[PDB]
Each structure stands twice: as structure tokens, then as C-alpha cells.
């Protein structure tokens, strides 16, 4: 390759230290709320070649990535790559990232505790939720 | 309170057809399948028991078996006993549970709180 001279050895995108030397299509996965498929379908509309790394970029590319990344409907990331489809409050097809991700997980758990449902007491107790066969499991992390 | 961008007065004034886009996959699935006559009659007993109450007072609790009832938002504010095999658990239907079943509110078994092994 070449030696790109603007190489930030640390990236800071949305309250996350990103190892900027990693591949761009696999360093966006490092934050919560974005996996592998999602950052790829971002970059196919974020108009950055996959050949580059994550520290080889311009901030104009960074600001258009975060622009598409917070405006997922306006840049043709349609409503199945989204982290949350229909919220409890607004039902708005919208991506939810790391701080808001833990916030909305906490929101749903606090809701189901307040609901007094079969799920909410499991989530307060920290047990299995999807009806598992624990006749041989439940080993690591139980005391 | 707001659900899916729709309010409580907005939901309770909304028709039965327009509910069927505002729910989950299983819930829109079952409302496509159409409710049974038993659940119709249970909602009718809920109408009678929510109407005849004094206006300060919460309605008289109606007990029921049907754990597979979709909590319609019209049921919000009532008190329903839910049968989990042994004991009718009496739940006040708050508006936070309009997208769930009754069956999760009367938790069916008792949590395992271990002892100690004897002869293993």
C-alpha cells in the first residue's frame, strides 16, 4: 500500500475508543449497536472503499458516516437493518447505539419489572428467559 | 403514557381494525385469526364488572383461567385473577402491558431455591 500521513492511532466515535488501525468494515463493529452486516450496508451507502483501513480516512468521511449512521432512513438503510423496529413509545423505525442501547435495554427491563410479567422477574433475578433445559446446565456464574 | 407514538385516549378511541397494525407479530397474528367466543364472553363480564363499580372505586376483580388472552388496552384499569394451576393471582391491568398475555402475570411455578445433596 502507501503510508497515509493523517493516521489517527486512536479513533473516538460515539463514546468509544476504536482501534483505528483495524479494518474499517470491522472496527465499526467494535462499538455496541453495530455489528458486521450493518456497518457494511452503511459503507456501501457511505461511499468508502473497503480496501482502506479505519485510520486512513478523512473526517468528512467520518462525519458523513455518522450522518448516515444517525439518519438511517434518509440514506437508504431501510427498516430491517435497524436495531429497534417498533419501540414501545413511538414505534419509530430507528437505529439505537451504545449508550442508548444500554438505556433501552434498561428501559425494557424496568418496564417488565413494573409490568409484573413472567419475563420481568426473570430479568430481575438474572436467569434464563427462553425456556431452557437446565437439567445439566446452569454451571458457570451461579452461586 | 404513549405506546408506539399513540396515546391512551387515542388508543381507547381507536377502532378494532386499526389496532391490528400496532401490535407484535404473534399479536397481530392472533387478531388476524380472530378471537374466540369464550374470550368474547370474558370481555363481556369485564364490561359488566367495570361499569357497575362506584366512580371512586376500582372495579371488582374477575377471576379467569384463560392465560392465553391478549391484554387489550380496553382492559386497562381492571383487576383480573389469573389462574396458574392453583391460585388466582390478582393483577391490576396497568397500561404498560397492552402488548402481552395474561399468562405471564401469574407465574406458574415456585422458584428453585436449592438445598443440599444427600446420598447423590
Amino acid at each position: 500500500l502507501v503510508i497515509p500521513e493523517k493516521f489517527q492511532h486512536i479513533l473516538r466515535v460515539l463514546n468509544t475508543n476504536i482501534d483505528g488501525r483495524r479494518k474499517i468494515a470491522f472496527a465499526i463493529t467494535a462499538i455496541k449497536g453495530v455489528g458486521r452486516r450493518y456497518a457494511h450496508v452503511v459503507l456501501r451507502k457511505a461511499d468508502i472503499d473497503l480496501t482502506k483501513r479505519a485510520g486512513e480516512l478523512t473526517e468528512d468521511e467520518v462525519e458523513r458516516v455518522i450522518t448516515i449512521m444517525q439518519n438511517p432512513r434518509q440514506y437508504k438503510i431501510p427498516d430491517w437493518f435497524l436495531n429497534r423496529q417498533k419501540d414501545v413509545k413511538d414505534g419509530k423505525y430507528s437505529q439505537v447505539l451504545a449508550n442508548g442501547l444500554d438505556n433501552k435495554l434498561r428501559e425494557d427491563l424496568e418496564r417488565l419489572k413494573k409490568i409484573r410479567a413472567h419475563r420481568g422477574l426473570r430479568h430481575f433475578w438474572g436467569l434464563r428467559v427462553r425456556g431452557q433445559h437446565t437439567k445439566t446446565t446452569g454451571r458457570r456464574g451461579r452461586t | 403514557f404513549t405506546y408506539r407514538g399513540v396515546d391512551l385516549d387515542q388508543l381507547l378511541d381507536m377502532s378494532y381494525e386499526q389496532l391490528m397494525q400496532l401490535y407484535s407479530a404473534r399479536q397481530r397474528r392472533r387478531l388476524n385469526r380472530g378471537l374466540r367466543r369464550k374470550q368474547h364472553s370474558l370481555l363481556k363480564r369485564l364490561r359488566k364488572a367495570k361499569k357497575e363499580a362506584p366512580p371512586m372505586e376500582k372495579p371488582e376483580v374477575v377471576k379467569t383461567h384463560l392465560r392465553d388472552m391478549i391484554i387489550l388496552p380496553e382492559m386497562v384499569g381492571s383487576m383480573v385473577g389469573v389462574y396458574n394451576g392453583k391460585t388466582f393471582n390478582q393483577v391490576e391491568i396497568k397500561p404498560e402491558m397492552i402488548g402481552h398475555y395474561l399468562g405471564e402475570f401469574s407465574i406458574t411455578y415456585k422458584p428453585v431455591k436449592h438445598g443440599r445433596p444427600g446420598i447423590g
Binding site: 422477574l121 | 383487576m79 390478582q90 391490576e92 402475570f105 401469574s106 415456585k110 422458584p111
Partner: peptide, 14 residues
């Protein structure tokens, strides 16, 4: 803070 409705069963789940 046990509800006035439900039994001791769900209250042991509380």
C-alpha cells in the same frame, strides 16, 4: 409492597 390482589405464589417470585 405486595399487591392486594395476587397470592403468596407470585409474592415469593417477588
Amino acid at each position: 409492597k405486595v399487591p392486594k390482589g395476587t397470592s403468596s405464589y407470585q409474592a415469593e417470585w417477588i
